[PDB]
Design a protein around this ligand. Structure first.
Ligand SMILES: C[N+](C)(C)CCCC(=O)O
Ligand SMILES: C[N+](C)(C)CCCC(=O)O
Ligand SMILES: C[N+](C)(C)CCCC(=O)O
Lengths: 495, 495, 495
């Protein structure tokens, strides 16, 4: 049974946002590029203090009165080996192969700190910035929530699907099940939908360029509309006929494949450089870290932090509860100090590995003038430029297959987990473990695709960026509210 | 009853120092600018190691065997809210509005690290340096003494007026009440007198420029002599007729006003920039902090640390016992870890707030070419240039009133507290709580004014700088001696 | 009685390595300069991660479950005053006067970070780099082994001469006394021999230039062959006739002399600058430290870290067990936290003192154009250039004596301790405290001299550098293996 309380509002709005946008894709990019410019240039610092304060809680968790506190109070389900590996595995997606490949070009073209284009000082700081946006520092700002939920799930033995179920000890039962609790759940879902809808906007064009390389078929917006539909079908069949087995295997193979391609690119993409460059960019990270963390550039108005630093932070703000729930669900029976520790390590190892192998590889192709990225981007768009970095490797076809398969099924498990995440939080609380209403699952998977297409239809990265930054604005609060509950609540039932 | 032991010596010397100086104000500035150049350029590092070693004791206090040690051993007098606020309030003065306004111009004109004048790299480091000289780092070097006195006052239940009363457990009763104990008290008072006499040299010209703006009356040395005298009268009346009520209210209003003007300048002086710039200058601070802390420039001989970094340190060395006593008197019944913590935080919040609002505002006026600071300074002097930064705000007259009143009464409470601090430490130990000999109180307030006038008479900042750096030389030692007592003494009666 | 197990192999190889090298000193420098270029440019990072991971164990020792653990479990033999001083004294040698003098010139000529030659930014970072290569950071990476041995010697009460006697709890008794345990001991000795043979290559030319200055006799390779032989004789007489008394006195005088010459150069070599420069280079160190620690320069290919940073690390990797044994033997009855603490402090104070006095002095001579280092080096070689820095001081002859004597006997105690270190580890385990077989002691002292001569014969620093880097490759492992034993073993008999 559905919950009209949280079902109808987002479906209306997300329907409306499509309506106005799809009606005139010219005026949209005149406001898409106007909404983005506003938020980042005046509220960019808000995200950054958020990321430096949640960073404080990390040290407070590890070194506070809750450090040796054990959540759940029993033996863990997983061995540390499997447990760590499950985090290590969760770092594979479509958007990562996308960012892991091209992010270094944008750091090297128009660098931060007023450095010159393609300068050596810019190639120094190039990788080091990826290690910052995707390192132990944003992962640390997830620990407060992953501990929060693992606390609620296991210490307080409750069960939350929607975040409002956590705000009980700050606004009381009156507000929670009232209007206040629905305003946040309507927001959280809408912002979630955009965020997950953008993951498709990044995913499909990667998958289609692989297709264009292996099969020769022309990359068109009409083709992007196909694969998305085929993904809906693939998932619609998978849910209806149970098939929860096969999806898990595919998700397994995606992980084990991800290691092969990384190992591949690392092996033949100059292993000597990558190790050196990494080493050189770890020390460059640690030195400039407080500068990157508090960057706004108000005196030169370069636009770097606003472009990358705050937009990433908005991408991190969003998937907080989304991912912190996951980390909580698996960190059963552990103590909060060893959660935050094994988490940050195991995660960072996954993300650092990708950006250095893929990014350090991309740099070499720019360095050795093998490839002209600015030309490819102006002509065919971003995902083409990325695909050609993969193509500039020995055994291109086997490689492009290796990514094609990867970048494909990585989105299949993305859509399957998405429809689930929504339908559970969209319907009414049935018995836990049960599968969401088969039909409502489908509907969301289609509702996303429309957005994904539109985001592809508008063209460029700006719609993606603006969609997530927008969604990151309310979830800015929602995230703190969930933490403020734990902090308040744990002050009572833990000591 | 007076104490000729400590009364006569300083009165003689300070009388003499006026005599020689006021007799030929040309040769004075030939030695004023010669004494300054010597001390900073060869003993500048001495101050800095002092500030880095006392900084070490902070961490030793917080993380040492004295951390959870409680001084006084009872419930505190104040709630943390009031207690913190009392520190927050103590950051208002006349010299701060002076430095908070113009300090950034000197960092931006001739910057450190060999940077070019008015360069973007210089506007980056501009504010960040103020956050360093007036941040949690110099405040941390007060904690060792504030804990020392709060220890002596409350653990050892004694009562010190003069610092020599603390040196009992390192030189014994023979030296303390002998010649050694008087040499330091004669020094401590003389250096105190100069230091408090310089606070007037910074105060009056601010007050007079406000007068020149609102009333039109010409700023003259003859006018500076008036207000000072009127301040003596205002305080002479206030002490004689009790009036300890009204002074406390005025001191209250000064605080509550200080917030209004800051809030004002912050509201209409571009709140967007100030927040950004602050954020950008916090990260710039943390990154270059060990460089600023150990700066001497021996290879380029630029003269930056000597000019600002060591002169500020000398200003910090002086008011140590002066301020650490204050912090001790109020931190009653607290533990040394929570003193050092709430202190550094509450204080820094007060000082950081000022320098960023006032300094970040001043920069904008330079940036947008609204104002020409170097011209104003060459023509009318510093305090005029500062006044015009305030005048370049919407509702200038209401603003200039808001500062006029502020910058006025801030010096009234400064003179009232001064005469008290001296007369108590100048006379004999009466019953605690009693008011110092009514007449001797007046005499000191006049003895200061003569210096203040002379320091105004000599013109320029150099006499101020040289007067405090000179006073900071002996108090360099005196401060350590008081700490070495606590360290030695606490090793005995605490464990 | 000798141990043919570990006697014959190194004697064969080291004999062979002389054979091939001494047969054609032209082709040798074509491979000497080829082996060096390979290892550093591709395995340089291996050394650096080693130095950053062992650096991690330091903090793990101080803050881990072994922190308050006491090794030996009794009162220490030495008072802390003597104990610290014994570390302070151990920092005197011939190679240090060599590196302490000329190292700053190489940092100032062709600086790191792509800085320009003789730039002010290069004179800033000049000293700060010495404080890094010879500071608390490489000393911290010795603590894990010094605690390891002090653990084995005193907790496990065993006695190790050869490192293989420590690998008992990871490869079992089968491997230890088998082939595996001999492969490492053959390696450890060979690499030791080269490392100690290089200390002579640095020592003699210093001693001979002093001779050329005081006595006028021409510096020739034939003369270098003399002094070395005379050193063998001096030690051959010293061992045969007991004389363990006189050697200890000479070693005492060398220490007490070392302070005189440092104090001398510090007194008349501009004490004002040295204090300033030091202060300025401590803050420069702390700021760039993570950059220096993780430097590889893969994007500019300057060659700085490979030249200095990895070659020093290889010099540190080697003397680990050599020096960690020493520190262990004296740190009897102490707790591991107070070992690591007093060690790092007492040591660094010794090394920092030298490089700043000698290096900060050398810089001034370059700065004030008193001396032309590049000309002297091209013409007479390095040790001449160093000698002239000493000669550019007031009372040159008394100074050059002061170094001559120092730089002489410093090598006498170096050869005496060397033959002992080898012969003990070369022969069979007699009763501890006994003197090694009188004859085999001599033989090694000669075997070294041949290398030293050859290393002088090949000319330049490259043979020295290549000899130690080569020896540092296997001992890279050996060092970890000894630590992995302690870590494993202490997990059992300590908790
Ligand atoms: C977790 N996040 C969103 C910060 C990056 C990982 C991407 C993914 O695994 O979906
Ligand atoms: C405390 N101090 C002297 C470092 C700055 C505050 C100025 C004042 O409150 O009088
Ligand atoms: C200990 N080490 C080899 C790193 C430097 C000291 C030189 C010496 O004392 O022989």
């Amino acid at each position: 049974g559905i919950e009209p309380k949280v079902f109808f509002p987002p479906l209306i709005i997300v329907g409306i946002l499509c309506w106005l946008t799809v009606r005139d894709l010219d005026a949209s990019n005149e406001v898409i590029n106007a909404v983005f410019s506003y938020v980042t240039n005046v509220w960019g610092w808000a995200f950054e203090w958020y990321m430096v304060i949640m960073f404080g809680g990390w040290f407070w968790l590890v070194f506070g009165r809750y450090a040796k506190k054990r959540l759940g109070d029993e033996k863990p389900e997983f061995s540390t080996a499997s447990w760590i590996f499950m985090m290590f595995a969760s770092c594979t997606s479509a958007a990562v192969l996308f960012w892991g490949s091209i992010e270094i070009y944008y750091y090297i073209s128009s660098p931060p700190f007023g450095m010159e284009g393609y300068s050596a000082p810019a190639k120094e700081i190039g990788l080091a910035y990826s290690l910052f946006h995707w390192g132990p520092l944003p992962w640390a700002t997830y620990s407060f929530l992953s501990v929060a939920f693992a606390y609620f799930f296991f210490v307080r033995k409750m069960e939350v699907i929607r975040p409002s179920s956590t705000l009980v000890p700050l606004v009381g039962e009156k507000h929670v099940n009232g209007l206040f609790g629905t305003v946040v759940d309507n927001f959280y879902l809408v912002a979630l939908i955009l965020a997950m809808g953008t993951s498709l906007g990044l995913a499909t064009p990667l998958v289609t360029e692989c297709i264009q390389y292996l099969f020769g078929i022309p990359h068109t917006l009409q083709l992007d509309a196909i694969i998305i539909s085929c993904w809906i079908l693939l998932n619609a069949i998978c849910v209806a006929f149970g098939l929860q087995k096969g999806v898990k295997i595919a998700s397994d193979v995606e992980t084990y494949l991800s290691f092969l391609m990384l190992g591949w690119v690392f092996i033949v993409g100059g292993a000597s450089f990558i190790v050196n460059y990494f080493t050189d960019s770890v020390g460059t990270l640690l030195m400039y870290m407080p500068r990157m963390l508090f960057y706004t550039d108000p005196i030169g108005k370069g636009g770097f932090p606003q472009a990358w630093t705050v937009f990433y932070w908005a991408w991190w703000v969003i998937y907080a509860i989304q991912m912190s729930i996951f980390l909580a669900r698996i960190s059963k029976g552990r103590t909060v100090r060893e959660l935050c520790l094994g988490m940050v390590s195991g995660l960072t190892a996954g993300t650092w590995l990708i950006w250095t192998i893929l990014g350090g590889n991309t740099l070499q192709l720019i360095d050795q003038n093998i490839l002209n990225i600015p030309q490819l981007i102006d002509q065919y768009g971003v995902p083409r430029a990325i695909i050609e970095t993969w193509a500039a490797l020995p055994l291109s076809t086997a490689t492009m297959w290796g990514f094609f398969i990867l970048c494909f099924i990585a989105t299949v498990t993305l859509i399957n987990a998405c429809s689930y995440t929504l339908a559970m939080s969209t319907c009414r609380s049935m018995k836990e473990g049960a599968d969401p209403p088969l039909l409502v699952r489908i509907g969301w998977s289609v509702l996303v695709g429309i957005i994904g297409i539109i985001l592809l239809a508008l063209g460029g990265l700006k719609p993606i960026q603006t969609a997530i930054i927008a969604g990151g604005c309310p979830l800015f609060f929602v995230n703190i509210m969930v933490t403020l509950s734990f902090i308040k609540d744990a002050k009572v039932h833990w000591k």
